[PDB]
Design a protein around this ligand. Sequence first.
Ligand SMILES: Nc1ccc(C(F)(F)F)cn1
Length: 544
Amino acid sequence: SMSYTWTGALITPCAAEESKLPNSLLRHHNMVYATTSRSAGLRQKKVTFDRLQVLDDHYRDVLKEMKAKASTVKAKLLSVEEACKLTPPHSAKSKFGYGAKDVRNLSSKAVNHIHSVWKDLLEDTVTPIDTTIMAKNEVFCVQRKPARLIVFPDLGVRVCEKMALYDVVSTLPQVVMGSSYGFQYSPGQRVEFLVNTWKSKKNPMGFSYDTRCFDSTVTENDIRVEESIYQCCDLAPEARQAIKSLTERLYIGGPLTNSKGQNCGYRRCRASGVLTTSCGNTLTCYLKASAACRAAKLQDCTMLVNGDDLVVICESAGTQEDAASLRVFTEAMTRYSAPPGDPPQPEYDLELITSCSSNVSVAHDASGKRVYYLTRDPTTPLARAAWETARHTPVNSWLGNIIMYAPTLWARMILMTHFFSILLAQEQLEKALDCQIYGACYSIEPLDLPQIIERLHGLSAFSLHSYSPGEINRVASCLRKLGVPPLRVWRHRARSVRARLLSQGGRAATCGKYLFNWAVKTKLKLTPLSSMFVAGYSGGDIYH
Ligand SMILES: Nc1ccc(C(F)(F)F)cn1
């Protein structure tokens, strides 16, 4: 069928939509835009097409292996109270007279409605369920992306999803997919694993695979298979019925309704704004790729899967033979309805492969020992940082990136300096800030950063020092390209900040001592002083 059909009703905004900055971070403010509903139509054209899916024996076999491992999982139902507590404070309200605030408080109005939505789930396993459709507001840098489409059901339903499936999507994928399951790794854990699986090959070859608009490529069959997998778990019988209902009424598809309550059409592919999205896309990606590997006689594959994002490291068969078996791999994925965006390409250097928007690089600690860490082209981070510092926003990408990319050259020299300067200037150091990690919302105290980083990256994070020439040129370039002060200018700014922080004692002094030792010249000695990287949840409406 078609991924979507349209009525012609517009995808409409809920509120005013900014698309540009209203400046000591970056000069070329021209280059930063936010996406808006103004670009919905273009995206609309890209995500809508027919899906032809041909299975084969490798598909059927990998699924059989997955269903066998899923049968070792036992999963419990979540009480209303637990499901309510997982709902973010600012999650979109219900069209039935209550908001997340009422949900979090166990207001008897929200809970009663939630009871009725659940009851109706058990009784009716057919009637499609209403979804809202929305263009996202996401900041990027020039050289333009159409806004992504987000699709999500009413708050009431979302809470039922949690009850029915939070335990499953938190617990199953790991067991089903073992070490391929990306969201069980912190960044140092992910580097360590990529690097070890690369050293483990006699003659290694790697390649990422970009599936073109993955959410569209997911078929209604795919979503029933995925259900068939959940069902292999030892479930409560009420969980079993709600899961059949949710999938048949919502996951499989349904009507799309814009912010003004008009009907935009009907979806027959993955909704992005549901609980099963990450888990769904990760299982569906692992299954197709694991099978595509077999079709292409790829020798000795290890995979890493994070939703629609896929890395494969295997034994090379020769550079010709490689290029070729990769084309077969692609044919297989295409048959399975996951055709390519960029066409995939072999790499014989781990450092050259990008996955989850990231790549492995290396530097050196105090002792000169070499250290691998995860980094990325810092353009979108800096872009969003400029946005976040200009317009006030609920989301703080900067902090997320400081946490994820603490070891990187750019996060230490630029993000850390910049934002500790603002916080010191605003006397807002003590305040918790919300940020996204593998799609879940965590409240974090910026002064905790040092221990957080020590815990997730090791102490070497505070003293890495001979960054690769490629990495240094990527940063410098991005700075010039963007109009951000070169790295030497941050060094001077950091000494100033480090100093102010040191003067305040307590945890600020630790922030200054640790975060900015790289900037001093004569170094201080840096001695020693989380259920966060377990599962993926973007679009799952989760808070911890
Ligand atoms: N040519 C490059 C480009 C980037 C990198 C690193 F930053 F990822 F290390 C290495 N070599």
